[PDB]
Design an enzyme around this catalytic site. Structure first.
Site, PDB file in Angstrom:
ATOM      1  N   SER A 106       0.902  -1.116  -0.008  1.00 36.80           N
ATOM      2  CA  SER A 106      -0.072  -0.054  -0.166  1.00 36.80           C
ATOM      3  C   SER A 106       0.988   1.406  -0.055  1.00 36.80           C
ATOM      4  O   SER A 106       1.626   1.312   0.885  1.00 36.80           O
ATOM      5  CB  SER A 106      -1.018  -0.050   1.307  1.00 36.80           C
ATOM      6  OG  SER A 106      -1.421   1.408   1.521  1.00 36.80           O
ATOM      7  N   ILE A 107       0.686   2.023  -0.982  1.00 47.00           N
ATOM      8  CA  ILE A 107       1.378   3.306  -1.222  1.00 47.00           C
ATOM      9  C   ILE A 107       0.962   4.378  -0.082  1.00 47.00           C
ATOM     10  O   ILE A 107       1.821   5.021   0.398  1.00 47.00           O
ATOM     11  CB  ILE A 107       1.293   4.110  -2.586  1.00 47.00           C
ATOM     12  CG1 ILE A 107       1.960   3.041  -3.640  1.00 47.00           C
ATOM     13  CG2 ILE A 107       1.886   5.258  -2.678  1.00 47.00           C
ATOM     14  CD1 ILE A 107       1.915   3.386  -4.992  1.00 47.00           C
ATOM     15  N   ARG A 108      -0.501   4.325   0.319  1.00 46.88           N
ATOM     16  CA  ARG A 108      -0.962   5.215   1.036  1.00 46.88           C
ATOM     17  C   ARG A 108      -0.358   4.870   2.605  1.00 46.88           C
ATOM     18  O   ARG A 108      -0.111   6.013   3.024  1.00 46.88           O
ATOM     19  CB  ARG A 108      -2.494   5.035   0.962  1.00 46.88           C
ATOM     20  CG  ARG A 108      -3.032   5.252  -0.342  1.00 46.88           C
ATOM     21  CD  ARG A 108      -4.454   5.160  -0.465  1.00 46.88           C
ATOM     22  NE  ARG A 108      -5.116   5.382  -1.772  1.00 46.88           N
ATOM     23  CZ  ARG A 108      -5.213   4.549  -2.626  1.00 46.88           C
ATOM     24  NH1 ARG A 108      -5.291   3.232  -2.215  1.00 46.88           N
ATOM     25  NH2 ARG A 108      -5.832   4.882  -3.779  1.00 46.88           N
ATOM     26  N   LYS A 187      -9.167   2.954  11.338  1.00 50.80           N
ATOM     27  CA  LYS A 187      -8.671   1.645  11.571  1.00 50.80           C
ATOM     28  C   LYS A 187      -8.358   1.728  13.193  1.00 50.80           C
ATOM     29  O   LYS A 187      -8.175   2.837  13.702  1.00 50.80           O
ATOM     30  CB  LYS A 187      -7.407   1.277  10.997  1.00 50.80           C
ATOM     31  CG  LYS A 187      -6.028   2.008  11.592  1.00 50.80           C
ATOM     32  CD  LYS A 187      -4.771   1.094  11.315  1.00 50.80           C
ATOM     33  CE  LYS A 187      -4.687   1.153   9.461  1.00 50.80           C
ATOM     34  NZ  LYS A 187      -3.259   0.437   9.175  1.00 50.80           N
ATOM     35  N   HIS A 220      -8.606  -7.664   7.874  1.00 47.80           N
ATOM     36  CA  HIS A 220      -7.950  -8.199   6.763  1.00 47.80           C
ATOM     37  C   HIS A 220      -7.235  -9.409   7.654  1.00 47.80           C
ATOM     38  O   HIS A 220      -6.315  -9.880   6.837  1.00 47.80           O
ATOM     39  CB  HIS A 220      -7.297  -7.319   6.071  1.00 47.80           C
ATOM     40  CG  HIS A 220      -8.108  -6.421   4.916  1.00 47.80           C
ATOM     41  ND1 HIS A 220      -7.825  -6.029   4.199  1.00 47.80           N
ATOM     42  CD2 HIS A 220      -9.579  -6.153   5.189  1.00 47.80           C
ATOM     43  CE1 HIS A 220      -8.817  -5.279   3.639  1.00 47.80           C
ATOM     44  NE2 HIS A 220      -9.883  -5.498   4.212  1.00 47.80           N
ATOM     45  N   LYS A 222      -4.740  -8.950   9.859  1.00 42.51           N
ATOM     46  CA  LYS A 222      -3.282  -8.608  10.180  1.00 42.51           C
ATOM     47  C   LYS A 222      -3.225  -8.111  11.395  1.00 42.51           C
ATOM     48  O   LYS A 222      -2.049  -7.447  11.799  1.00 42.51           O
ATOM     49  CB  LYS A 222      -2.587  -7.968   8.976  1.00 42.51           C
ATOM     50  CG  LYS A 222      -2.686  -8.417   7.759  1.00 42.51           C
ATOM     51  CD  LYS A 222      -2.210  -7.613   6.569  1.00 42.51           C
ATOM     52  CE  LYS A 222      -2.337  -8.239   5.266  1.00 42.51           C
ATOM     53  NZ  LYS A 222      -1.667  -7.120   4.152  1.00 42.51           N
ATOM     54  N   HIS A 224      -5.501  -5.769  13.423  1.00 42.48           N
ATOM     55  CA  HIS A 224      -6.092  -4.678  13.485  1.00 42.48           C
ATOM     56  C   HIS A 224      -7.228  -4.588  12.977  1.00 42.48           C
ATOM     57  O   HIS A 224      -7.806  -5.416  12.176  1.00 42.48           O
ATOM     58  CB  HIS A 224      -5.103  -3.451  13.220  1.00 42.48           C
ATOM     59  CG  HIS A 224      -5.169  -3.022  11.676  1.00 42.48           C
ATOM     60  ND1 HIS A 224      -3.817  -3.669  11.192  1.00 42.48           N
ATOM     61  CD2 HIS A 224      -5.834  -2.407  10.775  1.00 42.48           C
ATOM     62  CE1 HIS A 224      -4.007  -3.412   9.964  1.00 42.48           C
ATOM     63  NE2 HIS A 224      -5.047  -2.463   9.674  1.00 42.48           N
ATOM     64  N   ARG A 226     -10.539  -2.810  11.066  1.00 43.53           N
ATOM     65  CA  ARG A 226     -10.890  -1.939   9.768  1.00 43.53           C
ATOM     66  C   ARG A 226     -12.407  -1.323   9.852  1.00 43.53           C
ATOM     67  O   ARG A 226     -13.224  -2.183   9.958  1.00 43.53           O
ATOM     68  CB  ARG A 226     -10.387  -2.369   8.550  1.00 43.53           C
ATOM     69  CG  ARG A 226      -9.128  -3.040   8.481  1.00 43.53           C
ATOM     70  CD  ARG A 226      -8.543  -3.279   6.983  1.00 43.53           C
ATOM     71  NE  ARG A 226      -7.094  -3.937   7.309  1.00 43.53           N
ATOM     72  CZ  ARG A 226      -6.167  -3.746   6.181  1.00 43.53           C
ATOM     73  NH1 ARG A 226      -6.362  -3.057   5.070  1.00 43.53           N
ATOM     74  NH2 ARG A 226      -4.851  -4.448   6.389  1.00 43.53           N
TER      75      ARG A 226
HETATM   76 CL   LIG Z   1      -5.894  -6.279   9.241  1.00 44.29          CL
END
Ligand SMILES: [Cl-]
Ligand SMILES: [Cl-]
Ligand SMILES: [Cl-]
Ligand SMILES: [Cl-]
Ligand SMILES: [Cl-]
Ligand code: NA
Lengths: 312, 312, 312, 312, 312
Positions: A106-108, A187, A220, A222, A224, A226
């Site tokens: 993710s660039i953002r 998030k 997702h 990982k 955390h 969202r």
């Molecule tokens: Cl996640």
């Protein structure tokens, strides 16, 4: 976009150094006529140094492309440098260099890390250790879970002992902003790796129910939460299943943390559980659209309490 | 303009140092009353140092002149310094100082080099050696030919292994911009890395015919292609011929490189060939305006000609 | 969009009058909760009069829709009035009213007619007869062919005895502009219904080859040429076949004018001819992508002539 | 430009009525492909009415032309209407229509008349008779001499019983402004056709010597003084001689009024006198650049008197 | 104003050091209630250090005063520092300390020196010695005559071997600009205080007669020419006489340099000559208003030569 869109490897000693592309080299590459066989090769602009493989043309915004990044901004350079600094600390070897650069990230998330890093108020500004750890997590070169301390960043909109909630200000990004002006996403990162009390969970759930009622609480996998519009959930499921499927394919570590069943949207917990159980997309995904028997509400009256609080 | 419009010489031991003019010295010179015998002498402004010879007044824009350069801009100073640095590397002697300073050069070419030199992305920023080479070529003090690496620069609009095509940004120049807003011109420099492959010649010609069908492909004989509107061809013809003629009169050797007959506009190739054969401008230009169908087989008869040479 | 997006029918005498929607009525309708059964019914805003059937929601731009029209602009009202004036002249009967309003038309074509109509320099400003005829052609209520006099409009960029070429300035429209900033399109209308000399055809072809070399010369069969980027041709073929297929289905007048084979792009003439012959989309369309044996060029040397003209 | 650049004749009843061009009709004509034989005919734009003959293309400013007039301004329309109103008062005959329109006039003079006539302070606003007279003089359809009442206009900078001096504000014009920003010119018209006393002449000469010492006092023979920079005198000589020759050739009587020898610059009087005597340009011009022995001036110490008035 | 408006003395070692006022110290002083006995004493603002003696209140612009200086500008501080630098180089002792600060000087002259000094193109920027000399002359602590090298400055509008003519840009000054927007004045300084050839004098006179015919050439006797509007001469006369008369009465020597009679306006020369001879203001000044018998023109035909040069 691939890490290969930002930097190229240079062998020094036994180890690889990574160097940011000049934006005018990329620009030259975009106007270049290149043989099919050389699409996966680094490009020589002659005047502006090396440029990324022409196969990545669509990662870059131009007159006829708005689905890529604004590589001529200063943020492109800042992100490229952020990436290079992290990769340089790894001492990547001959064998791994291609693997490392091919990782799509993710660039953002990276622009947000730059924003943290450049703020003297922020711990990342003062700790190179934490900055590197945060970046490594973001570029797929760490086993560590993203937590509050190593979070991508944004604006803090809620915080208690156990959680920190961030607004992702993607609409205002320079490098690759979200273009849909209706976008809103948050998030929630965990402050510590430590058992979380019922009270602290209840506090988060109450905030989410009161202040973000039109948002699904998902993950997702990982580590955390969202917080996404219900109208975006189906798309999130598509992204999540594909990533999961792909990881099963490449035998890559496919650990998926379901998170707290009292917090996650009931339907999303069903969808992800069925996914982990090895079901197909169709079996999984249809659980999202089904009205389910409301589970035993662990925290009744939360919204009413907040309501009465506001009135007084 | 003459190089003497930017700097003056000062003898130090066995060779000259060149010093840039202050813009207010030039401004004072423009208001000065000077003896006819002194029109060719450098001018003392008393307050602002030495100024250019009054005979060059028309090279500078004023209230009654818009056909010169904008000497009060910072670019004047930057170009003057670029010139001095290059000239200072030559160790110019008494024998050559007058010839050097009387050389007329393209001011726009020089502004373009400043623009390259001041850009951190550009190799000229990092290579004093290449910067000097590029400048020396521009001010007529080099045997070397301008190529991609030593190009005046501009915006790259096409590139392959053999060629780089540049859009000339003259309308945006500070020192002496083109004032006709209809102006469009490109140049194609040879990359000169390796010998050229016909694959790349075909790619260039395809780009030129498809994307620039309204432009003539010509050259001024200095080793690169100039992509100009057909409607400006006659003017280029005049300029090229004058320069050629002048070099004959004076004694300078005429090195006119015709380049690739498959790339150059057929009429231009004919015009320049006739020029090189010593024909009058009138005779040469007739070829420019003549309807002319491409030469099938310019290599037919090469062996027969060798045969007849031996008989003679 | 359907004509039903602009006005609603009102019975006066035996005949139907048509009335423009207020933009705030439409706005109210867009926020309305409506039963499935009433989606095809006119909507009562209460405060702002009648609004179009809610089934047309997507014809209107909102926060979450950019694929419709900007109905809150003054041009919406101007176009609605243009439509109403034309429909009112028809004395539409009970039986036909639904048929008439369901016709899908080009909104941009109508905005262009408003632009013609409101310009005192333009014949449409002074002739109600011609304005009505032009509008009727545009809204599918005329058998007449669009010609120069009745053209949608735009900027004249070429004209001779037989043809008028228009630039369609869709990028600058207020009601429903093209959003892709790379868009460029022209149309060539016939000045008169009268045999056209070889000379006048040659003049058009020469202009198109010289000035618009990167444009395919096509037609949608309605009596005029459309000058479109080659990169857009496949899309035009899709639109054209669908319209043709649909007309065969509804038994509607499916007259398709191929136009002059010397002017139309060879491949497009092949595609449309095969379409008329009754072939499927796949058989038809593949003719577009095939490099064909260049037909006997009716006008050799045209581009060379223009070239030589420019040089002199 | 020619009068035919502003209007075309249309026969109504007994005689011709002149009608102004629509600017979009002109714009269309500029894009038109026209047969050689039709270059001198009025052009039909179809959409925007009749346009000027294509032979006059260069009279109009376009992207590639800056030497003509800005025909898309409102001043074009105003000038056109002014011309038409004057022409429509003449009842021009079949035998004269073509010659009337072929007349080359000063567009700037016409814009100035528009500026006069639209100003309610100005007498031309209140007198159609004076307005028509003024216009007829400007467009070469009058035997009358331009005087103060019928002057083209500008800003009054000096006035006495006998004369009125005007600054010609050509830099600020909309239709065809002078482009040279260094331009300055005045004219002195006679207030009435009577003998002028020595005192009133002396007053004018005093003002000219004091306030306009860097300006030559000349005339083009049409009955008023032109106050022009000495640096523009030779150019005025060329224009004046050219016109004089042209008239003699076409058998038109010049009627060159030399004006007061006490006011006109000595060298200009010599030049124009030699011209009237029938000498060649070369012989006349030679008198301009001749430092001739002063005639004694009939007004001694005029500048001395002005100085003393200033000091008081 | 008095030098004491800018700085105060502080005894350090053997001599006095001069220190600039803070502008807020002055502002405080302007609000202060002070005993008449202390009006001539330096004021202690307590907060912002030492301030000028309250007797100088009218030298500073305030709400009720626009006839003083703008002491809150940065130019105030710059001028103050310029003065201090010059005074500090003198090692002023108790003997002269009070007379130094009492000297009234031209503030505008000093602002111009700051403008020279801060310009890297100007010799004053690079020579502290010339800067000190120039300043010492301006603040009346030098016997040297102001010449080109030490000129106050302005814009150079003419220069030759012997003279430099400057436009005084007092309208644009920050500290104490001239407020009459009609103001125009020039000065001509000698490049060297040496005898000057007739040719070089002639060149100046020719320029003055041609380009500045509406200006009187005068002097205030301090070694340079002042070019002033004839309408301002009587005022200059009053100032000049008052200073002459005052110097007589104050024992100070006059040393009035009449300058070159071939350059100075005849009436001014007569007036100042009569002044130097000891006559009364009434007798001296009336010579300004007398129409004098023209003196033998030293350079006849200068105006004609320029005219002819202009025409060719
Ligand atoms: Cl996640
Ligand atoms: Cl060249
Ligand atoms: Cl069509
Ligand atoms: Cl005249
Ligand atoms: Cl003086
Ligand atoms: Na015509």
């Amino acid at each position: 976009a691939e890490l290969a869109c930002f930097c190229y490897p240079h062998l020094e000693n036994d180890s690889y150094k990574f160097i940011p592309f000049n934006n005018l080299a990329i620009k030259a590459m975009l106007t270049a006529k290149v043989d099919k066989k050389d699409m996966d090769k680094f490009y020589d602009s002659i005047i502006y140094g090396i440029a990324p493989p022409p196969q990545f043309k669509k990662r870059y915004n131009t007159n006829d492309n708005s689905r890529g990044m604004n590589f001529e901004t200063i943020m492109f350079t800042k992100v490229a440098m952020l990436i290079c600094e992290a990769l340089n600390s790894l001492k990547v070897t001959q064998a791994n260099v291609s693997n490392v650069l091919s990782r799509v990230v993710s660039i953002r998330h990276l622009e947000n890390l730059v924003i943290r890093k450049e703020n003297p108020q922020d711990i990342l500004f003062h700790s190179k250790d934490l900055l590197l750890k945060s970046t490594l997590i973001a570029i797929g070169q760490s086993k560590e879970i993203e937590t509050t301390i190593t979070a991508e960043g944004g604006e803090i909109v809620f915080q208690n002992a156990a959680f920190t909630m961030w607004k992702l200000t993607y609409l205002e990004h320079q490098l690759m902003p979200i273009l849909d002006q209706n976008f809103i996403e948050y998030k929630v990162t965990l402050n510590e790796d430590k058992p979380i009390s019922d009270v602290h969970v209840k506090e988060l759930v109450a905030e989410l129910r009161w202040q973000y009622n039109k948002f699904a609480v998902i993950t997702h996998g990982k580590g955390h939460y969202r917080i996404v519009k219900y109208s975006s959930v189906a798309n999130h499921a598509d992204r999540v299943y594909a990533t999961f499927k792909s990881n099963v394919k490449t035998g890559v570590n496919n650990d998926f943390n379901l998170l707290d069943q009292r917090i996650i949207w009931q339907n999303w917990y069903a969808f992800t559980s069925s996914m982990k159980q090895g079901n197909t997309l169709d079996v999984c995904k249809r659980l999202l659209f089904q009205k389910m028997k409301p589970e035993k509400n662990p925290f009744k009256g939360l919204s009413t309490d907040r309501k009465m609080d506001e009135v007084s």
